[PDB]
């Protein structure tokens, strides 16, 4: 029941124990790497999943055994026989929400602002990419308008998702036995550009909604081998959306999920253990939001990014290519850590709260991820500030905290996570800078991970909406498209089963809850502050419910009751 | 890194530390009960499975997803279409060893001495039970002999498995939807008597089944005595006897007398012994993950809708009653359930020999191999405790050890009324026997009853945990459909394979190889000698398996865990 205190304020015998405790934690929490990704060398037993967590995780795996027994899907690398079969994969599981409406263009587009990866869409400024040769004739034909691309861009109506990150990927390979011999096949890579337009009129109703304009499946334009597809292209348009969804799913899993929630949190958990005493106020604040994070990252090391793991079998590129994308997304996040704060991140894509027209309306008014995440970001910020101000009243105490200074030096260190863009001037000198750091770490661990992890089942457990790999080249625009052509593009049965298995495991339960730690703060002042944060969460929950009532489709993933306290699944 | 020491041999400051540590442990290891079974209230995080364990357990679960994906079995309460379908449940799993030869009478009988439940067979003395009216005409017709039942009993040739303990079971019920209507059905329970005979001729002598009476009260029409000359009726009779053996195995031999009887010893260790107490340092490596696996059994095995509810013959309530009665009888006669005394009480111990000095049951691989492990463990804990206890007064004056015993004997501490003589632990050799039996149960015994489960109970027709139709009339015609209706429906056969695969996927630890070494150099030396003996025992068992009809691998030291952990 020790009261938290800064190291400078203690007695040389108190300081001695802190150093002893820190020395013990350093031995227990040793730094390691797998394929260049920072991870703990050996996991401490105290950091393992609880018994309660294991019981829930086992219920999800047993439920997959039962659902597989009921299902007609087979353990083969053959395609499905019918498109309808993809809808029979859930006899004993909840039906994914996107399954009925996934063919609709609005449903396709909405996923950009309310699906599993609401992190790619950016507003177009000045012009389109020169490798994306959309013409005025195309835009006017799709929008049934006389407006030009330049006029639409000048008014902030055009948005784009550019998947150039996957352009350098080496295509994944798979093999199997079919009649005594070994078959070797290769996945098809795509790095599409997708143009979206915001339509105030909407489809029939006056609500308004983002609509997709064009898709170019690969980066280098060519009128024959890589044309621009539009909604008027019919079946070809449908296939183009499949490849775009595959791109979004690969960026989601590599960049948005694994890299920028799970793995960028690992250095902060390790630096907290390696530099902060158990009774340090920052350790007492951050640790609830690290519960099971080291453990779930070890499972990702063993099951997700391993040879034969989920990323190896399901994603578009080779395991080596996927890990290269993951590490590059980690480095850019760490180099520009402060710039990936939620308001600055949205503003850099031109879809922040500040991006408005002359009237003051946002260019992208319907962004449920943005609106709900902003509420959680602001509430966490207030909570962190009140908490830290209980222990930091003057910025000199920030500068005089040796454990905190070591904590920052460990993070910016090459072997400690290389968070080069953590602080300004090479040192942490102000309370408000530490407020922003702790705010972003808590926001990533809870709200952000909730927003990318939980929609995975609703949108990626139904394979046709977002297949993690495509298994045939895009058909020629002139070429006829049968059901078999699509079934050959979509994943074979065994790999579709593997994708459902992965998505079900990720969203089967909530290991903890935002603002509700296992152990109450020893300090009464901290407990009152935590209580205030919980009260704000209840208010935010009610506001989101009100927002959901008027929204086209409810967006439930950032409801406080659905946000975990930590990245733990 | 604190040298182990007895509490009375410590300074008052040191004693205060032990009392504080013990008080902390008492708060973390609180006693709780589920359906009258002593369990832990809250599992401490340090007692959870490791990350390494969870990785192995997840591999086994994922393998069942993949094996299910490659199977043609469906999620229905219908029977299989063909008996052959039971052999196609393992496209991506190891084929159970018993699958090819389970119809053979010798393979049926040898499971009594080398199967998952080698704990039931007992030698017949004086007479058969009066409710088991086997006649000289039956015995002579089966053995193709003129010897009488009395003469064979006088020579110690006859053995019996009497499953009367299952006679008071309430039959289990299952229900399911069919055409908008809810079908409700009931399992069929049996409490058979099975007569076996030791046949020297066979060359190598082997045990042979002679008669099966499916239920306890004899009746020539509704419960006759079946013999190998009854064809398909004999085959069905063996099914019901195997079902009985499986239910006694899971309720009595596995859950009750490995997992659950170990629980009070783990909690008493945490509640009465300091961390540097020599007995705690000796036993804790053999308790690794035991509290955790018992919590999973509480949640998945004996729970409403759990494995025992779905798979076993009786209702969950009926099964739990059998479990608790086995626990209580074991605790009341704890010393008597030591391995040599247990075997001797069933008349199949090393001392049950004829006039020539030959054992009445020469083929008993469980007995021979377990005796080797029992003797080696006994030497190991004798030398270990000799390092800390040199004279009897130390045992008497060890206040933590005396509280340890008093906690175990107490009603809320597991009621181990037969743990100790004279109401008090007074001698060193008594503690040797207690620790030897606890370590033998947690490692060797659990290995013997747990790991044959896949090889003998994952192939459903060899040992179905429940039967789903009454035994047909002795003169009724038997079709393949009659047997398929007796065997479990598809969904429950899948559930049984699911259970057996998780139980035998991996070995969480290994006998004589703890995670952390003893801080005492003398203690480490004792352990090293124990490992050397395990190596020697491994070679001797390998030689025995070369000279045996079928190899018995489950008590090889490399296959025996250090603790009951799966
Ligand atoms: Cl067009
Ligand atoms: Cl075209
Ligand atoms: Cl007969
Ligand atoms: Fe996740
Ligand atoms: Fe077991």
Residue numbers in the entry:
A (entry chain A): 1 to 569
B (entry chain B): 1 to 202, 206 to 569
Authors' text:
Lipoxygenases (LOX) are key enzymes in the initial step of lipid-mediator biosynthesis. They catalyze a regio- and stereo specific dioxygenation of polyunsaturated fatty acids to yield fatty acid hydroperoxides, which can be further metabolized to a variety of signaling molecules with diverse biological functions. CspLOX2 is the LOX with the highest relative amount of bis-allylic product reported so far, hence it is a suitable candidate to study the molecular basis of the dioxygen positioning at the bis-allylic position. We demonstrate the importance of an active site clamp around the pentadiene system, which fixes the pentadiene during the reaction resulting in 11-HPODE formation.
A key residue that is located opposite of the iron ion and hence likely restricts the space in the kink region is the highly conserved Leu304. In general, mutations inserted close to the iron in the kink of the channel had the strongest effects on the product specificity, while amino acid substitutions closer to the entrance or the bottom of the channel resulted in smaller changes. In case of 13-HPODE, Leu304 and Leu502 are rather facing the side of 13S-HPODE formation, while Leu506 faces the side for 13R-HPODE formation.
